[PDB]
Amino acid sequence: MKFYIDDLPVLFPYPKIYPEQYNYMCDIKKTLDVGGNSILEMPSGTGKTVSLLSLTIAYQMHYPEHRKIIYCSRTMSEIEKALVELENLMDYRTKELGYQEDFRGLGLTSRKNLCLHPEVSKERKGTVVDEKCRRMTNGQAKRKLEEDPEANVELCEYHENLYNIEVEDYLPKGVFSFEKLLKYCEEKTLCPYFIVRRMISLCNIIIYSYHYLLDPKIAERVSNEVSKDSIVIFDEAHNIDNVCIESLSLDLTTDALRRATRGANALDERISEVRKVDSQKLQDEYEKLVQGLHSADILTDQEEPFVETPVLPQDLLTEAIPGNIRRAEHFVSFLKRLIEYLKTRMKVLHVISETPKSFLQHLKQLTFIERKPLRFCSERLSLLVRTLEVTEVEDFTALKDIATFATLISTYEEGFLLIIEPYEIENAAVPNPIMRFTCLDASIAIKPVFERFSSVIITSGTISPLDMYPRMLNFKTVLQKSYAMTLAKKSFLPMIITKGSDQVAISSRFEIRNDPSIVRNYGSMLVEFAKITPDGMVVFFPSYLYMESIVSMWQTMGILDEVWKHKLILVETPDAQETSLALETYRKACSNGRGAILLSVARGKVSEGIDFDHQYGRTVLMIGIPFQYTESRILKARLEFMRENYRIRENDFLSFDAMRHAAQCLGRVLRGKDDYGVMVLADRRFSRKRSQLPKWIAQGLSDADLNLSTDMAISNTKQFLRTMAQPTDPKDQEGVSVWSYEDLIKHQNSRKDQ
Amino acid sequence: PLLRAFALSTSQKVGPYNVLSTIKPVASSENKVNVNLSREKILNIFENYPIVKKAYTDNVPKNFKEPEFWARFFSSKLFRKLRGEKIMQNDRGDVIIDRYLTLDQEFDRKDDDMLLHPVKKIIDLDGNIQDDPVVRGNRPDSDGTVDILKGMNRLSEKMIMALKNEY
Amino acid sequence: KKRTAKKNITPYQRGIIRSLILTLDCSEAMLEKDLRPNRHAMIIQYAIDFVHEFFDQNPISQMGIIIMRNGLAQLVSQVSGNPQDHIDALKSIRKQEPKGNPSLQNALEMARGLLLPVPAHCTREVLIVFGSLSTTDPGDIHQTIDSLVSEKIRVKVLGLSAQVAICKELCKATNYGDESFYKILLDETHLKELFNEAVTPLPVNKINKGFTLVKMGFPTRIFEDTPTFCSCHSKLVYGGYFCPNCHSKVCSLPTVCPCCDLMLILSTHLARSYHHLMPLKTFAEVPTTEKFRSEDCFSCQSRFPILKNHKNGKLLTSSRYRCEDCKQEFCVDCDVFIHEILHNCPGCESK
Ligand code: SF4
Ligand SMILES: [Zn+2]
Ligand SMILES: [Zn+2]
Ligand SMILES: [Zn+2]
Ligand SMILES: [Zn+2]
């Protein structure tokens, strides 16, 4: 199609359209006209990605100003989803237009999933791979190699071929999805990571995960060339706040503290030996401190920066010397005092939580070490290590942990809160004190971007209610609109199976435990569904331990034998690799004959990015409703902050979060409108939350479908599956809900110009 | 045409799948003599699991695997495979049983090793998780039974691969 | 309020010769309780009905029956042109009870083997009455599907109360892509009409393929009675036919000569074909108030026309569903009868 938005050619890649998509285009354009934020809940039953990209590409390529687009999907999985879809859009746009492209748009993830060097990438832990690539191609090992040709220094050489040809120019012209990028850069033997990383200065539109936007420890290279004005799109933004918090929290365990002790000892050895060999350079660095923050080589570092800056991006940093810390031995002694104070405060008997200011004063009491010198510890340690040009980091992992802790707790205040839990009550009365440190205000991490960028978007197939986010994140919006699934047919059957056959209220709320009534009830539910649905089914237990116990003692009964007799079982397990393997076998079985069941965790990785299309998902479940307070009081503290700072009570917030995750789980089971699928729930408490759900889910959830028993549930879903199976394709009722090629939109809404 | 028909009616390998599995699950009752599909079930076992075939073969010259062999097999295998780790209780998994247990451990290990594809980067949960960043989370969501889950995964994938084999 | 086919848009080609290999489903699934006796008994009954019908309307084709028990495909009737053999085979089966899982792959491979001898002008086909929700394959399936479509073997399947992805792929694959052949049912009557529509030859839009003249000859009945003697079953039969060329007796059939192997027919089979090739234009339902035509039937003489102004009754409709080319009326019963049983339109014959 090529219709108009009263100024904008739109090269929508499909002959068909959807109505909701057209409204989406209209409203997002209206947003881009006037600087605002205007969160927009478009049900995932449609294609939100196609609408977003089509309109935004057309806008950027039509007006002359907003030259760059930033797209932040939650996980690299959705990164490549957006990438492949964008590539197809681009091909369509060229095909309809000839060649008017001149367009580049690149994904951006990390070394671990990009480093092509065989031996390097053979490593598993991402941090190690990062370190290996750093050493193999640093500003220093290159000098060691070139000045001293020797077997000591090797290189990916992909960095070298880049240095030869790629950093004069760019990749040919494509919007390279990771499949395409990896294939090509394998052929031409390049290092994809550095390729895209340097390329950022030229890509018309960039796609990268949230962390690269909010995690200050990697959101450093944000080069306002990237936007300065750009139009920014948050896809799948319902889990924003937790990304901020997890980007700003921090953990401590006495064992890591002892590791830091070992690292400090190794540091003493290293400084001793080097100052025996060379100290004049160390004094030169003393002078480079005394002149200023040493930005000339604490910041002008093509390859150097060792310890990231966990504080917000340099906003809350001074630039003078850290006074006495200028001496390296002084610094080591400072860290010694710090770690010992941490140990003794760690031996505290029971739970204790403090404001950072309070803890700061207490440390001052025990050892008068001031805040201002403390803040500089991170870069101090990092550049000291650079001056030490150490051969390994594993010894210093705990050191950088402590540096991060010091910087955070010395920098921010009155938004964060310490807490010292001496143990894990799930195995209480054991030695395992943890110095948990976390933020409370989600808005802190976001605030810089809403400060920087002007026109931003928020979009998800699940966001609800559309007012909690302006509250929590403390940001101004314009258009807070929700879109309704205009369907000429039912197409999915939300239910609330509150009572099993025993007509007994059920949930996971009681405990994390057994109560054979509940267990047998759920097992009956699951097995009858496994009998009835065709290939493809999911479940979403509320928490991992819950699944572990439940399935263990299901296997105790014979319940699993029956579902074995019908379909396949594919559990969800903590190691990511095996999880991916299981998931792909699930897909392979669904599209094959045998039906297959995958049971996972709502909070877990599976729900985050994985998609469940027509075949791959028919009948999700929600065994229980996901809640967190199973574990300790960090949620309690954050909720305290919530109540005092925002006019929000506990159960309100808890229910809101729970329904957020529930909707995120549920929305996965549809892709288009041709798709369909049951979406059951299961708990007594669900019945009253019917309004918390996103609108388009609520519409399909009629009143009569509440607190149904399992039996009537099976009846209804049987009738559904049969009815949907029918080829109910009048194709004239689809002129209502499809707005066919170039005309029904044109006719209908060009008349609706009223 | 009669010949062709006959030949096709002959060389008709049954599927693996259910009966193959079942030979460990759906087969827990007839503690009598040669049960249902006795030769058929045992050959399904053999194609399904090399270890039992090898043990039975090794225990032909002595120790009859008909009654006493299958009796001890109940304990040993049907605890090893299928249900939870018997660990305690009837530890009849002895001699050939225990030996083959030890074997099958690392054997299934090496099989699983032989299973790892470089999955296409849509699904790549591995590269998906954590292998973008170097981050610091929390984690809070008790041994054993994880092996049970790996067992069912391994069984299913072995089945499917014995079918992608295009034998 | 009407439920009519708008237009027929392949009234130019069909597969007149056929070799359809119906494959039933006799596996543990078919023992559930959704259709009155079960799935299985009702299935076999309707299968008998369909066998009679199909060998009527396509009286020159063959057919073979295949079951799927215990994951095996066991041929229960060689591909043959005599309805009675297949009928008896089904009779025998219906007293036997299903077991094991349906091995769609094995049945498919057995068919593909079975239809090899069928010559080029004859057309192949299969009709899976798939009842279960799974298969159990001893091999790659897409391998088989590819082999199938390589051997030009259309397939139509009639699932029971669900939709299975692989079957949908199967139908979409062999039938030149054009997906319409995976129709699944929602009621017993729907099932009857399913088989009924399976009876007819099958066009979609045929690719330009080889069209070939086929040698065949017609027999002449015999006279003597005591001289009972047969050359196709080696019995004494009181009188039969003579191959015009082989010149040997053959018990009554449209069968192939068992001596010189050329097809035998009378003509009435060819007449059935003619009926299928060029059907009529669907009879139109005349306008309620704009007809002003004769108040009777035409082929019959029915008194069911109207009522002349009766609030809602006359406002309903005017039973005058009238064919186009002859432009003469016909009551509903007459139109149903013409378009079902006899296809010579009464008036359109006369001019
Ligand atoms: S970017 Fe190049 S040098 Fe670095 S890890 Fe990847 S392949 Fe190795
Ligand atoms: Zn005869
Ligand atoms: Zn003859
Ligand atoms: Zn009449
Ligand atoms: Zn006529």
Side-chain angles (χ1 to χ4, degrees), chain A, chain B residues 1-8 11-13 15-16 19 25 27 37-75 78 81-82 84 93 101 107 110 115-123 125-129 131-137 140 144 146-164, chain C residues 1-220 227 230 232-233 239-248 250-251 254 256-258 260 262-280 284 287 297-298 300-301 305 313 320 323 326 331 334 337-339 342-343 345-348:
Chain A
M1 301 174 45
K2 172 194 178 179
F3 59 105
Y4 288 85
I5 314 295
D6 329 329
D7 194 14
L8 288 88
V10 165
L11 247 62
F12 190 102
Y14 288 167
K16 49 180 148 301
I17 196 40
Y18 283 86
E20 312 85 329
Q21 294 183 14
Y22 183 83
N23 289 339
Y24 192 108
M25 307 278 213
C26 177
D27 307 4
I28 184 195
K29 180 262 181 185
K30 180 172 186 181
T31 311
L32 269 344
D33 309 336
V34 35
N37 310 336
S38 284
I39 127 183
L40 292 158
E41 168 203 8
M42 167 70 145
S44 73
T46 334
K48 110 183 63 91
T49 321
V50 198
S51 51
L52 265 182
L53 288 192
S54 37
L55 183 135
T56 44
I57 290 287
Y59 194 108
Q60 148 164 332
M61 297 296 307
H62 178 267
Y63 292 175
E65 302 79 357
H66 253 201
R67 303 294 75 186
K68 323 253 71 182
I69 301 175
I70 277 77
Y71 188 108
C72 333
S73 63
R74 223 204 310 184
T75 52
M76 81 88 65
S77 192
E78 295 160 15
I79 277 297
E80 63 229 340
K81 257 176 193 58
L83 269 202
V84 54
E85 190 277 350
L86 172 70
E87 162 196 325
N88 284 350
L89 168 67
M90 196 47 61
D91 284 340
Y92 166 94
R93 172 180 286 264
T94 80
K95 170 64 175 53
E96 278 206 4
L97 272 203
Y99 199 124
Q100 303 74 4
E101 327 159 6
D102 67 278
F103 208 71
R104 323 174 54 86
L106 293 188
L108 168 60
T109 153
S110 133
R111 284 182 186 80
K112 159 69 185 194
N113 36 15
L114 291 187
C115 187
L116 198 142
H117 179 301
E119 165 55 42
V120 171
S121 305
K122 284 211 306 297
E123 214 282 349
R124 188 41 137 274
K125 181 65 166 305
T127 90
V128 175
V129 181
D130 125 82
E131 156 276 354
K132 206 154 304 160
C133 175
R134 292 193 72 76
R135 152 197 297 170
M136 168 152 307
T137 72
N138 247 319
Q140 302 188 358
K142 56 158 294 300
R143 305 177 298 100
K144 315 184 185 72
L145 193 41
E146 60 217 19
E147 315 306 325
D148 346 308
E150 62 217 349
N152 311 144
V153 190
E154 54 280 6
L155 63 213
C156 285
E157 150 276 6
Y158 304 107
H159 185 4
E160 302 325 290
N161 323 130
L162 159 104
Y163 198 98
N164 311 149
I165 176 181
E166 184 37 61
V167 197
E168 290 81 8
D169 187 0
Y170 12 94
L171 294 195
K173 264 324 292 334
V175 279
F176 289 88
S177 62
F178 292 170
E179 179 199 38
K180 190 175 175 195
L181 180 55
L182 251 61
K183 294 195 65 173
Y184 157 90
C185 285
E186 200 280 345
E187 309 294 64
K188 309 300 191 174
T189 174
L190 254 285
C191 44
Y193 178 86
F194 297 97
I195 283 193
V196 39
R197 180 67 58 118
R198 91 160 250 259
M199 196 60 59
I200 297 296
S201 296
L202 308 87
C203 314
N204 321 123
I205 168 178
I206 4 173
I207 349 268
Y208 44 50
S209 157
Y210 278 134
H211 293 298
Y212 281 80
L213 196 47
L214 317 180
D215 202 26
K217 32 184 70 71
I218 24 181
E220 56 86 11
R221 95 300 129 234
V222 41
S223 41
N224 209 13
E225 167 276 332
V226 297
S227 127
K228 170 63 216 69
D229 318 291
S230 289
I231 148 179
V232 168
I233 310 174
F234 295 6
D235 176 7
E236 279 291 343
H238 62 249
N239 248 119
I240 271 291
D241 50 353
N242 292 77
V243 167
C244 325
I245 296 312
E246 187 190 1
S247 64
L248 245 285
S249 115
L250 183 50
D251 275 8
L252 275 190
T253 282
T254 156
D255 326 341
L257 280 72
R258 322 208 82 94
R259 304 183 59 258
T261 66
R262 270 85 62 153
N265 318 138
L267 290 197
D268 181 22
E269 315 323 301
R270 180 86 174 195
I271 63 189
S272 162
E273 70 221 24
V274 300
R275 171 225 29 81
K276 275 189 296 293
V277 177
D278 187 313
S279 189
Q280 341 85 224
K281 69 203 179 318
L282 317 180
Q283 283 69 89
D284 124 79
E285 284 111 36
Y286 293 170
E287 281 89 65
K288 295 198 171 183
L289 294 147
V290 91
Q291 52 80 18
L293 192 40
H294 181 246
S295 304
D297 215 14
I298 204 35
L299 304 187
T300 315
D301 305 336
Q302 77 306 325
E303 285 162 294
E304 309 157 44
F306 168 79
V307 153
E308 52 282 356
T309 75
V311 50
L312 248 50
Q314 89 194 4
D315 40 322
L316 315 185
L317 280 78
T318 138
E319 300 73 15
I321 63 179
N324 52 6
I325 316 193
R326 286 174 37 81
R327 171 53 42 91
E329 333 306 290
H330 279 36
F331 173 77
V332 181
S333 57
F334 302 150
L335 263 52
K336 200 63 56 55
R337 256 91 56 170
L338 223 292
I339 181 62
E340 296 323 298
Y341 177 85
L342 293 188
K343 188 195 188 303
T344 174
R345 302 287 290 169
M346 186 69 98
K347 272 103 63 180
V348 159
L349 56 148
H350 57 1
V351 53
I352 182 58
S353 70
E354 299 302 327
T355 132
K357 167 181 177 54
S358 166
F359 152 86
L360 178 152
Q361 173 271 357
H362 180 285
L363 171 71
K364 176 187 184 65
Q365 288 289 343
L366 270 193
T367 314
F368 294 77
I369 316 300
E370 291 291 68
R371 175 183 193 270
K372 174 170 187 176
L374 182 53
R375 279 153 61 100
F376 283 169
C377 88
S378 299
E379 26 83 344
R380 172 60 171 173
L381 161 65
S382 352
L383 106 158
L384 284 189
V385 171
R386 184 189 90 193
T387 61
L388 295 170
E389 52 280 334
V390 306
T391 175
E392 66 165 359
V393 179
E394 58 82 24
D395 36 0
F396 316 138
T397 57
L399 306 181
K400 72 183 49 54
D401 253 333
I402 299 313
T404 289
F405 189 106
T407 317
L408 278 190
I409 211 56
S410 190
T411 310
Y412 305 78
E413 43 271 338
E414 55 70 47
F416 300 170
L417 160 134
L418 249 179
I419 171 181
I420 319 177
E421 299 284 13
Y423 70 116
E424 275 48 57
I425 193 178
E426 296 179 355
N427 197 334
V430 301
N432 50 335
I434 59 172
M435 194 95 50
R436 173 66 182 172
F437 168 46
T438 152
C439 158
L440 314 167
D441 187 343
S443 77
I444 289 308
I446 300 305
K447 178 62 174 177
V449 305
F450 292 166
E451 186 43 60
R452 282 181 39 82
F453 302 161
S454 53
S455 315
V456 82
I457 306 298
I458 292 87
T459 300
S460 303
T462 256
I463 298 174
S464 168
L466 279 61
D467 296 352
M468 280 287 96
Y469 290 87
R471 301 269 294 101
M472 305 155 41
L473 309 177
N474 180 18
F475 72 105
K476 181 63 158 47
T477 99
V478 199
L479 291 77
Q480 314 202 190
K481 198 50 85 173
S482 306
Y483 292 162
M485 181 67 63
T486 89
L487 222 307
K489 193 168 43 179
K490 192 46 181 179
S491 72
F492 61 93
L493 289 211
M495 311 181 187
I496 305 287
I497 315 314
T498 275
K499 329 164 183 181
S501 176
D502 55 359
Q503 308 297 329
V504 167
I506 52 214
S507 164
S508 63
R509 186 185 182 183
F510 84 109
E511 288 149 33
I512 332 295
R513 304 284 79 82
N514 305 23
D515 30 1
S517 55
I518 305 301
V519 158
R520 180 188 56 260
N521 210 9
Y522 284 160
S524 52
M525 186 189 325
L526 180 61
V527 62
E528 57 207 353
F529 277 106
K531 301 188 175 183
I532 179 182
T533 106
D535 46 358
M537 136 137 69
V538 211
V539 341
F540 283 91
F541 297 137
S543 296
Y544 192 80
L545 259 311
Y546 199 93
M547 175 190 318
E548 171 71 301
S549 73
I550 282 294
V551 177
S552 60
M553 53 85 46
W554 262 342
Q555 170 62 18
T556 276
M557 299 153 61
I559 168 70
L560 261 38
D561 208 328
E562 195 52 41
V563 39
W564 262 125
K565 198 174 298 184
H566 297 222
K567 285 185 167 165
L568 248 35
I569 301 103
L570 283 167
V571 79
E572 182 34 60
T573 128
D575 52 340
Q577 183 67 31
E578 193 128 17
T579 279
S580 281
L581 194 49
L583 186 56
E584 75 83 11
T585 50
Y586 162 97
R587 299 204 158 208
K588 190 177 302 176
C590 288
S591 74
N592 188 320
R594 324 186 90 274
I597 276 201
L598 165 129
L599 13 86
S600 61
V601 196
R603 306 272 163 184
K605 68 207 77 57
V606 166
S607 93
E608 249 181 353
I610 285 305
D611 204 0
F612 290 140
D613 285 319
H614 340 267
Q615 296 79 337
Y616 311 141
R618 298 304 201 195
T619 86
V620 339
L621 277 73
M622 293 283 296
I623 306 306
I625 161 91
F627 279 109
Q628 302 83 311
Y629 183 50
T630 289
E631 306 258 357
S632 176
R633 49 182 49 186
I634 312 171
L635 287 96
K636 283 220 168 306
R638 180 191 172 188
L639 195 29
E640 284 282 358
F641 174 96
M642 169 59 52
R643 301 194 66 120
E644 56 80 17
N645 214 315
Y646 307 135
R647 274 57 41 198
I648 306 185
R649 60 239 61 259
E650 293 191 345
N651 15 13
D652 282 12
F653 186 94
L654 246 306
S655 53
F656 151 71
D657 141 273
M659 273 339 187
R660 165 170 75 180
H661 284 46
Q664 157 209 136
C665 295
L666 296 205
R668 290 310 172 79
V669 85
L670 297 99
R671 175 96 155 289
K673 279 184 193 158
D674 335 6
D675 192 359
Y676 68 96
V678 190
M679 310 156 83
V680 334
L681 283 73
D683 125 276
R684 39 156 302 179
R685 286 176 310 288
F686 277 129
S687 176
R688 301 244 300 272
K689 275 81 169 182
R690 179 177 169 273
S691 302
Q692 270 73 7
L693 292 207
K695 195 179 189 67
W696 58 281
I697 305 276
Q699 304 298 340
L701 183 56
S702 172
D703 184 15
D705 3 328
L706 265 297
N707 58 272
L708 316 183
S709 156
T710 158
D711 327 320
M712 55 184 60
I714 303 306
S715 343
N716 306 358
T717 171
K718 189 97 66 67
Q719 291 330 294
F720 190 63
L721 263 38
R722 293 171 48 209
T723 36
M724 303 300 309
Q726 257 42 62
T728 72
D729 327 314
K731 305 158 308 302
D732 61 359
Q733 307 170 357
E734 298 192 321
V736 156
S737 161
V738 184
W739 285 358
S740 57
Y741 343 85
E742 220 295 295
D743 312 338
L744 269 50
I745 36 104
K746 181 75 53 55
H747 146 256
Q748 277 180 41
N749 312 64
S750 179
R751 307 296 68 66
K752 203 249 176 180
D753 290 347
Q754 323 161 356
Chain B
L2 225 180
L3 298 161
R4 181 193 320 275
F6 190 78
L8 292 176
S11 77
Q12 184 169 150
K13 202 68 66 66
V19 54
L37 301 84
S38 306
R39 177 167 291 267
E40 300 70 4
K41 292 307 175 50
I42 65 180
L43 57 84
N44 297 136
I45 292 265
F46 305 147
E47 53 86 1
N48 204 156
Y49 338 90
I51 52 166
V52 26
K53 172 72 172 183
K54 303 294 183 180
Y56 203 106
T57 53
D58 305 333
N59 307 308
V60 176
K62 26 66 193 178
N63 172 40
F64 318 132
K65 329 79 12 192
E66 251 232 55
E68 59 293 77
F69 186 99
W70 293 337
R72 196 263 292 279
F73 134 78
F74 299 146
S75 56
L78 311 188
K81 316 156 52 197
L82 303 166
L101 148 73
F107 217 91
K110 82 174 183 178
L115 256 304
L116 306 188
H117 329 309
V119 60
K120 59 200 172 191
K121 298 202 187 309
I122 280 283
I123 315 302
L125 274 345
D126 187 17
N128 172 12
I129 64 100
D131 296 11
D132 316 11
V134 279
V135 281
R136 308 296 157 78
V146 44
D147 171 79
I148 295 172
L149 305 188
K150 270 180 190 172
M152 23 190 49
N153 272 11
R154 183 159 60 262
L155 183 150
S156 122
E157 300 159 68
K158 171 65 58 56
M159 180 175 307
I160 279 290
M161 201 51 61
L163 232 216
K164 202 182 190 190
Chain C
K1 190 258 300 181
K2 65 97 184 180
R3 314 288 98 82
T4 72
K6 261 48 66 187
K7 189 181 176 302
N8 52 90
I9 52 181
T10 153
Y12 215 0
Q13 212 124 11
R14 303 245 174 185
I16 279 309
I17 310 280
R18 273 155 93 182
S19 328
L20 157 74
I21 284 68
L22 173 138
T23 83
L24 274 183
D25 171 13
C26 307
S27 74
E28 52 163 351
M30 307 252 67
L31 288 185
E32 61 92 4
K33 301 283 98 170
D34 183 23
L35 298 323
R36 312 278 52 75
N38 56 28
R39 290 182 175 174
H40 174 268
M42 204 201 57
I43 282 311
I44 298 211
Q45 181 50 232
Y46 282 95
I48 280 287
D49 303 13
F50 164 80
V51 169
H52 266 339
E53 291 276 2
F54 158 64
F55 248 113
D56 180 17
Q57 276 41 255
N58 316 254
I60 341 166
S61 51
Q62 304 84 322
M63 183 171 181
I65 304 302
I66 290 188
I67 50 174
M68 298 174 309
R69 301 197 71 202
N70 300 335
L72 264 75
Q74 328 158 7
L75 185 152
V76 315
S77 168
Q78 190 80 15
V79 43
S80 295
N82 170 21
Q84 200 43 242
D85 325 359
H86 315 67
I87 292 287
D88 142 85
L90 271 60
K91 295 287 197 69
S92 55
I93 288 179
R94 193 253 312 277
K95 291 176 185 174
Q96 102 88 51
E97 312 313 307
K99 194 63 62 60
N101 259 314
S103 157
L104 168 64
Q105 148 73 6
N106 293 127
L108 243 301
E109 253 304 330
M110 163 151 285
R112 183 177 73 78
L114 208 45
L115 282 67
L116 243 293
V118 156
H121 59 266
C122 292
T123 81
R124 308 99 196 287
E125 193 164 348
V126 186
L127 194 147
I128 313 292
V129 183
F130 198 85
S132 186
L133 261 300
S134 311
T135 88
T136 289
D137 320 1
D140 171 359
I141 167 163
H142 309 73
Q143 166 54 235
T144 44
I145 285 187
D146 221 1
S147 63
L148 233 66
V149 54
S150 77
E151 297 188 19
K152 298 159 167 45
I153 294 198
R154 319 166 57 87
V155 170
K156 173 177 194 306
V157 343
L158 281 79
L160 290 211
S161 145
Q163 177 174 29
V164 194
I166 177 58
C167 294
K168 136 84 152 301
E169 175 50 43
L170 173 48
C171 312
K172 174 179 174 60
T174 90
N175 303 336
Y176 318 158
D178 270 335
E179 147 50 50
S180 184
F181 289 44
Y182 179 56
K183 259 176 262 301
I184 101 114
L185 91 167
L186 27 65
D187 121 76
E188 299 71 348
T189 79
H190 206 258
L191 149 134
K192 183 50 177 182
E193 66 185 333
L194 275 187
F195 285 81
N196 301 138
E197 61 215 38
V199 181
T200 99
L202 69 179
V204 38
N205 149 36
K206 304 284 166 29
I207 73 183
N208 299 24
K209 193 48 73 172
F211 312 132
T212 49
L213 295 122
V214 295
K215 207 177 190 186
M216 56 188 53
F218 318 89
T220 124
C230 142
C232 63
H233 311 70
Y241 295 69
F242 270 54
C243 208
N245 178 27
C246 107
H247 210 343
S248 82
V250 35
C251 283
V256 156
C257 152
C260 56
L262 64 99
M263 186 57 101
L264 303 189
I265 46 165
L266 290 330
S267 59
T268 80
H269 327 89
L270 316 192
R272 304 315 299 261
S273 67
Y274 299 137
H275 125 68
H276 254 96
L277 271 174
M278 21 73 176
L280 316 163
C297 169
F298 176 86
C300 106
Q301 287 205 350
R320 297 149 165 261
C323 144
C326 78
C331 51
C334 277
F337 173 56
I338 288 207
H339 282 310
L342 86 312
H343 300 40
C345 159
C348 271

